[PDB]
Design a protein around this ligand. Sequence first.
Ligand code: IFA
Ligand code: IFA
Lengths: 115, 115, 115, 115
Amino acid sequence: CPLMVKVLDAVRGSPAINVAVHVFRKAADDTWEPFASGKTSESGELHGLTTEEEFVEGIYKVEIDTKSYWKALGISPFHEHAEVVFTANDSGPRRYTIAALLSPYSYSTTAVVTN
Amino acid sequence: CPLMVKVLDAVRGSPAINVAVHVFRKAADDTWEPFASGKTSESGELHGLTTEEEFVEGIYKVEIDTKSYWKALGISPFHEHAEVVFTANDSGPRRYTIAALLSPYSYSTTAVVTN
Amino acid sequence: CPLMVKVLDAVRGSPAINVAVHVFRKAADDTWEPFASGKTSESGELHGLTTEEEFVEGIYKVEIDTKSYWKALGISPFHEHAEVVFTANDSGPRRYTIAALLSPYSYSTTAVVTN
Amino acid sequence: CPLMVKVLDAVRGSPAINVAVHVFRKAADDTWEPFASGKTSESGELHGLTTEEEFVEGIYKVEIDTKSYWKALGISPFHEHAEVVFTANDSGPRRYTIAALLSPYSYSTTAVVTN
Ligand SMILES: COC(=O)CCNC(=O)c1cc(-c2ccc(F)cc2F)cc(I)c1O
Ligand SMILES: COC(=O)CCNC(=O)c1cc(-c2ccc(F)cc2F)cc(I)c1O
């Protein structure tokens, strides 16, 4: 599993559960084509978005549906979502963990990339 | 005046100077349309993006061109850009300041909305 | 003027107003001595902490009283305070701005050092 | 294992390996008594700092020796360390994960607390 997404709630101090995540990949025509999607588990993690075969070189966008999450908790947040845009596998195949830490008016995202 | 963007560099401990910033507004045809842009000053700030007349309710996207910034410093970056997607809502007099703190493999963004 | 502290609230999307800030300087006896303190203004900023004459090289600790801030808003916090411990080093004319972005269970701090 | 510490490098996009971590607990006399210490693994994680028996209610300080880490990488950073101060087990025994994301002039820390 070369791509994992983790989401944390900075208000509750907990994993962010049931958060919708959409991954897009830039196509030839410069448009964003749907690549994969899922929901975070009880651990705030989303595995199994892709396989080494499908996860080719390209420009990817990971959209984390933060607004829906905060709205489900009765909170009216600032952002529509958190978006992480990056080139992958540009220098050989790696494993990417994309993490987002969420607050109503802020988010922090990081990437851990291991060979 | 209703919209300001500020960018900080977590590696150098300084404002992020000369960073390109592009703002888009979601059109009725569900597509992103260029709205405003510029480059951050020596203070890491970009003022004069828009006016009260032009800055109506709607969905906006701020793209901060982080990859080019890091490239210019000779530091290896992960993200193509930092993106901040938000709904502007009228609720009395509001100024929006969108701030981003940049590291090569991470960023933190916050919104400060004041009357 | 050589030291400024700024505090932001990631839950309300606003400056963190009236937050207590205590600064200490490490003494030769290896203990922390009160150096400067105050409360953040309506802009979330605390100016006038010290002067160029008083702000010599040394090791400093800035404690931002986050627990009391959250308590005053009725929000359940994790940290007793946010702490930022740093060495002040002379290297031409420097102003240090220490910024903290607060959530109930998280904080992000950065230093911006300008000439 | 009721206390785990994780450290990530925002410059390299990797776990922060071999980082020294010291945990203190506030004693009766209001002084910081040594509680536990360790080093992060190849995964940037530090388990086994304590046991449910030893990890009683109290005010704890987790000091992450960030300066030594950045210095070992040839980098001269801003902070002496990152410090996380919190009351634990004030409302029954929990499991605490304290995470820090490190850059030369900035750090972000969060807590995930699970029952
Ligand atoms: C009324 O208050 C304002 O207009 C605040 C605008 N400034 C900011 O949001 C800001 C935000 C940060 C900041 C951003 C992200 C983060 F993770 C930590 C920060 F301190 C740092 C500085 I120095 C800032 O000036
Ligand atoms: C080898 O190490 C990994 O697989 C890293 C995957 N995890 C993360 O990136 C991670 C990241 C954070 C984190 C994210 C944003 C931020 F501002 C601070 C953080 F600690 C917290 C936790 I708890 C995590 O596990």
